[PDB]
């Protein structure tokens, strides 16, 4: 079946997500305001959004079974390289397929393609990003598959600079095996057909989005007027040496 250990992994991951994902979006009132009326008018608001999301990704990662047993160095490597990908994953939960937007509970916090461009990004990122969100939504993942996918994304042994790639892979494979068993046990046809392979392809697509995001970010953040609008945490996690 799903073993007791596998069912325990899922319960831990679900609780971690529930503890780090507020589906009421209460905290958003404290972000710098959306400005839509370029100069990059959404940059302050989306910087605070992302900075908040990084704090939640860290809290989630901390609870992935095994993650605590990696060295500090490997933990930092994994979080820095995956943060943007997990934020893209976790955003899918507010994503609405119909109008290609992220609905975070408020007319002001319904984000669209123009909003993202007003943080300095171009359609070279934004269009593939929308296509990702759409394709991911159409997988109709259960919450268990969603949180397993985020955990797998974080614990990737191929990330630049990982030292104990053996231990990372062992932790990842434990999570992948949990996922595959969950799909075999619980996910109904036809949605279950090649589902694991589709999910793995989404992780590949995320590396592409990560690369394009990082290029665009490196460029925009090189302008001091933009950099000044970013939070110290964003600057550290998307930047540092």
């Amino acid at each position: 079946k799903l073993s007791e250990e596998q069912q325990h992994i899922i319960a831990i991951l679900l609780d971690a997500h529930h503890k780090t994902y507020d589906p009421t979006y209460a905290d958003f009132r404290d972000f710098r305001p959306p400005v839509r009326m370029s100069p990059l008018s959404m940059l302050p608001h989306l910087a605070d959004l992302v900075s908040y999301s990084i704090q939640k990704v860290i809290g989630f990662a901390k609870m992935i079974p095994g993650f605590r047993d990696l060295t500090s160095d490997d933990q930092i490597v994994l979080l820095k390289s995956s943060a943007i990908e997990v934020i893209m994953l976790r955003s899918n939960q507010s994503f609405t397929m119909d109008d290609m937007s992220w609905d975070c509970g408020s007319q002001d916090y319904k984000y669209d393609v123009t909003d993202v461009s007003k943080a300095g990004h171009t359609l070279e990122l934004i269009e593939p990003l929308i296509k990702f969100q759409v394709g991911l939504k159409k997988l109709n993942l259960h919450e268990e598959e969603h949180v397993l996918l985020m955990a797998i994304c974080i614990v990737s042994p191929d990330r630049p600079g990982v030292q104990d790639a053996k231990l990372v892979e062992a932790i990842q494979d434990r999570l992948s095996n949990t996922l595959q068993t969950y799909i075999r046990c619980r996910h109904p046809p036809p949605g279950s057909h090649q589902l694991y392979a589709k999910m793995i392809q989404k992780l590949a697509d995320l590396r592409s989005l990560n690369e394009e995001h990082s290029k665009q970010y490196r460029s925009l953040s090189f302008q001091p007027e933009n950099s000044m609008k970013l939070t110290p945490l964003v600057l550290e996690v998307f930047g540092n040496e």
Partner: peptide, 9 residues
């Protein structure tokens, strides 16, 4: 920095 300090333990 902040990541390292949050992960410390």
């Amino acid at each position: 920095p902040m990541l390292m300090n949050l992960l410390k333990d």
